[PDB]
């Protein structure tokens, strides 16, 4: 029942540093054992480090150790992880979890992760933050018809996407973002719906791009 | 199990042969651990 709130994802540049946030609401952070994992696209997750502010030590993955720091602020209840010397290897979603630390004796260690954030994607690339454009896919002419929108050019990932201000859900299909040869991201989201209710009906997607601080509300419906 | 036992009336005595011996000459001395975590 409690939510762990990362800060927001974003691109930095190689060899700069990078500082990633994690709110805890309803509980203190003293109470807890705070752990920071990444996931690489297509690997498993890893464990950099957690703190333990009911004791106050700090414990880092040998790999991560000397160039990644983590504090946990008990006036605000968040937690922090800086990365420095950031390079192409980093790019990965970094994870912000929890274990509960209520009955702890001294030298307790990080066992398991029950809460966790939402994660954080970092990207670190040279390209500048770009917002993307939203194109409407329109329907025409058995009992069932396809709309949808698109979003096209932005970086990094990921760009988020709700129908209906998340109302219409089953039947939505938003595909992972393909990279263009262009560059930039780009992606798709297409949802079924009866043919009966193309006119009386309305479809908005509602697609955010937080890193850009892009937010887009595209009617879909014919043309004539 | 073979216990001989010889009573001499002159001095009222009794003495009890055949017994072997098993004294306690020495000490051995080991450290026994357990370890614990304080809450």
């Known amino acids: 029942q409690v939510q762990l709130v990362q800060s927001g994802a974003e691109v930095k540049k190689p060899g700069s540093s990078v500082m990633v946030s994690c709110q805890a609401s309803?509980?203190?952070?003293?109470?807890?054992?705070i752990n920071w994992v990444r996931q690489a696209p297509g690997q498993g997750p890893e464990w950099m480090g957690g703190?333990?502010?009911?004791?106050?030590?700090?414990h880092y993955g040998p790999k991560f150790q000397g160039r990644v720091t983590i504090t946990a602020d008990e006036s605000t209840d968040t937690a922090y992880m800086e990365l420095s010397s950031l390079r192409s290897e980093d790019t990965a979603m970094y994870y912000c979890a929890t274990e509960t630390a209520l009955v702890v004796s001294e030298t307790y260690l990080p066992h398991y992760f029950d809460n966790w954030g939402q994660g954080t994607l970092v990207t670190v690339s040279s390209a500048s933050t770009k917002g993307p454009s939203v194109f409407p896919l329109a329907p025409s002419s058995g009992g069932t018809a396809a709309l949808g929108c698109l979003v096209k050019d932005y970086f990094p990932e990921p760009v988020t996407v709700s129908w209906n201000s998340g109302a219409l859900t089953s039947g939505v299909h938003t595909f992972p973002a393909v990279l263009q040869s262009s560059g930039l991201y780009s992606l798709s989201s297409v949802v079924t719906v009866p043919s009966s209710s193309l006119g009386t009906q309305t479809y908005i997607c509602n697609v955010n791009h937080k890193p850009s601080n892009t937010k887009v509300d595209k009617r879909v419906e014919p043309k004539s | 199990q073979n216990i001989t036992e010889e009573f001499y009336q002159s001095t009222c005595s009794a003495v009890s042969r055949g017994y072997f011996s098993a004294l306690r000459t020495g000490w051995y001395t080991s450290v026994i651990t357990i370890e614990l975590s304080n809450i």
């Open positions: 703190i333990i502010p009911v004791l106050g030590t700090v």
């Open positions: 309803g509980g203190l952070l003293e109470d807890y054992i």
